[PDB]
């Protein structure tokens, strides 16, 4: 009779955490295997074939795959075929946050006491995978912030789309797919990154519509020929790592793009704001803006101190909207 | 317009993960601090006192508290005064399932590739922090296995109580404190663990009540005679550690604590039985199975299987009880 009671009260208290924590522990695992990727509600996944393009054991993929069949994120559909469950993105969005808190973050979670007493030493000693932090966000914007900023660019119909930070140009090619006859100016410094968004370019068929420049955004405040005439003009994430020891760079980066537009066009900034109070976003908020205040050292501006930059660059207008993504806001700055 | 759609769309989305993964991460980091241990719903921590405490800059500590209380988990009371959130203990409860996953089994996510080539090398190779395990499945039992496990010895009324695997005694200590006239017998191995109860029992006023005895549960098999007369028997998820690799020292185990126990005594086991399919318990369930069968190589046995290992050792009759700890099983074996 008492333990069905502290079995009621302890489901309760529990809630959605235990499946949580599993799904994040079984995705951050099968994502640094490389499976994930093969994941799909749509489709299987031959183990036969994964197991050989990824270079594991086949009874070692079987096993994995088995333990997250009876997770319930997969579903055998035959032998050696997988099917991931139909809310599958939904539970990769989710496990995300706890892959980007958890997993990315972590040497801030287990250094702390270091950064709290010698943070030089601590910064360039305790560093994130930058995989991981690549991944989880993209995993938080599959729903949280990649959508609006797509629906935004797209609904705009532009001639040229330029992206500050493009990375494997997956935005760039998903608005040029849409709009028909639009170019777009891919800008990412990493050569890594730039080699694997030129033969993602060709295999769309938007090789000679879209343009990859292996360029720094600081390198913009310099050199802004790329951007003139562009109607849309993207920078997801990407200003807070200037601020604030490339305050100057950062103004005339914004200053060029502002000029540069062509009539109706707009520069469009996702970032994340500091320290909301709000329930629903204070908890995520606060997460975000401790590692990167504390941590990392990067400038989270509010909505009132990017409205301020944004006009003191010459934009006319500047619109906030809210985004899904707790502390995040998209700002529409207009010509 | 498109905007508040994506936003509505993406908030159920998200659902709960932002708050869990950023509670988990601020929980765990102030756990490696030692802060956490202070903050409580009912009294303050105050940060002068702290600090020299935790050996720690003070203001480093307000601004860790300062975001904590941001994010909401928190209250400043005064300055220099913190007070938990009343649902703190919920929350630290829900941190303890993504520690586990997450943090306490990290090397497994990390190095599953490993562990799949090279089993005997990566397991020595790629090991768990045991302080990792130890806090974050205390934080998953104070609401979804401890209270059961407790009121069950307290409500039996026992005259001497022993625990296999006690660890700090707080089990021990807390029937001792409720049960009037009842000793106890705390078994542990770890000369850390036992010097930390030695002193936990000596605070409490149990000390003539309580034995702390360092010894293996492995040695019980050879030498019985300290769980002679003992009303009841506790071991939480002491058991899979010996199976499969010491299966006949854990059955001479079982059998001398059948024969050892007095009349109408019991020894009430909690273990997790592997891979469930129930949609509440699938989840969490696969991934306790995964680790322990994949990673670690400890066998997790069914309830058919304890119930007939126990019916082996001699137990005239076993009860198995569901914990709301998602696989937890707890097994009351009757003399
Ligand atoms: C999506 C962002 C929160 C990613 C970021 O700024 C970071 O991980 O440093
Ligand atoms: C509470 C248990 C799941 C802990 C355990 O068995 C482990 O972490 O190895
Ligand atoms: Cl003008
Ligand atoms: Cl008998
Ligand atoms: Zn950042
Ligand atoms: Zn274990």
Redesign the interface.
Known sequence: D??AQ??????A??????????????L??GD??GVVAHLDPDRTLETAEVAAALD??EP??V??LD??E????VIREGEGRYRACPDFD?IR??????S????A??P???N??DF??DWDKAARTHVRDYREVAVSSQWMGS???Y??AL??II?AAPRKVVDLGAGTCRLLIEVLGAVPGSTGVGLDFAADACRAAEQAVAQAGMTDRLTVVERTIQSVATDPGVLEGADVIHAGFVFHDMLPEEEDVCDQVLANCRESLAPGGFLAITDAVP?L?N??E??????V??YHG?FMRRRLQSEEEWVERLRGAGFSDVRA??????TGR?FLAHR
């Open positions: 008492i333990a502290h079995l009621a009260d302890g489901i208290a529990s809630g959605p955490a235990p499946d949580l924590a599993a799904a994040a522990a079984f951050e695992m640094r295997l594991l054991p070692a993929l096993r994995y333990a997250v009876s997770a319930g994120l939904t969005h989710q496990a995300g946050y706890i980007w808190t958890m997993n973050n972590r801030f979670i287990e702390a006491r709290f007493t729903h949280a912030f959508p609006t629906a935004t609904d320290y109070r329930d629903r204070r908890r995520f908020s606060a997460a803006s401790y504390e909207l809210t985004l899904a993504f707790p998209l």
